[PDB]
Amino acid sequence: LPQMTQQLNSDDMQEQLSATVKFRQILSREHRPPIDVVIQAGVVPRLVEFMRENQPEMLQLEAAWALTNIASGTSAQTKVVVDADAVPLFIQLLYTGSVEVKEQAIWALGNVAGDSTDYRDYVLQCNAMEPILGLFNSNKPSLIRTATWTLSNLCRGKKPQPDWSVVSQALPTLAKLIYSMDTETLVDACWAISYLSDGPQEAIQAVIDVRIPKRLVELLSHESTLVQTPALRAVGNIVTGNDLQTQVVINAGVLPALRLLLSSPKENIKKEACWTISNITAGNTEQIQAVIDANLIPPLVKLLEVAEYKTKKEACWAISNASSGGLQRPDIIRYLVSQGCIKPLCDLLEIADNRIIEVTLDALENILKMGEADKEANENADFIEKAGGMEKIFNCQQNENDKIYEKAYKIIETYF
């Protein structure tokens, strides 16, 4: 290393390139990259020098490569590269470089952005977005694959979110990228969209306006779960918006897709499928009817009764939200009770958290109010007692939280 360092600080350029390559190789060792002994050599600012304009492009390439891997280490190691002011030069290389240098520069920026929200935002206020978006006019798959990964890191992270006015500029590009034949490009593109769609209704509308949702629904049937997971997440984020925005996803045919996803070998996919459905049944009566027509209730009921708890929660939300459509259209409740939803709802009261208990109690009251209305014109109350639920609801009066008590109290007093 001491000879490599001296060789690097030469002014012989042959030698500078020779030393940089040697530094690159050791930082590219297949196991245990000696990043900190390289940092301790104090060669990082020198490597950044090799990336400036007017350097031989082979030297820029090898330097950017070495700095890329140093930045791929711990946060402290990434900090050394950032504090050496390498980021503005990385971005400069996105203009002046070749496809090989540009892929290297965007790779480095990906590691910097992928460190923390601070460095993510830092890359963005260094005005990196515009030259980055310009890269996607390339005919190089690997350049676009790497740039998409970097782009996803820029859209990633909450507390705080990235500057929306900046990252939203990527939406037309991301809209095209989800039509890619390259799987790795496809995956990171969907993750980026899932991040961007995770926000206010203004953010969701932006995703809708660039006509992303329909392609997302298509990608739900992709063979790889690596594609399905961020796609389902993005779709699930969109339907957290208002009824109009949700209807866009419905018109895109998400309901038959979600039925397929309910039988996924991945538990987390089944959970987020339930979660997506629940935010659709949270909409108007017509949208609840659409869920029912799509034959989604029977697998939801079974998941409510057998699945893992984290999945049960979302299935509960779906059935409970659907029951709210019961006051306006009582046949919704009749169908829900007919599909045996009462007992799995009741059984949940003894194990669930206070929020789900509250969700469950609202479902049970809706069923009761309807069953009560189907009297002046209680079956459901009888079904609930036989379900062992009357006991469970009574026990909820022993809950420390007031809104659950008040709720359970009125339910018991009104219908029992």
């Binding site: 297949e30 891997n69 791929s72 280490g73 460190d115 923390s116 957290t240 987020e272």
Partner: peptide, 17 residues
């Protein structure tokens, strides 16, 4: 009403090997 079912910043880095 709608709902979301954790703000964790795992490092997302790739070394060139």
């Amino acid at each position: 009403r709608k709902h979301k079912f954790s703000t964790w910043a795992l490092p997302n880095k790739r070394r060139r090997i």
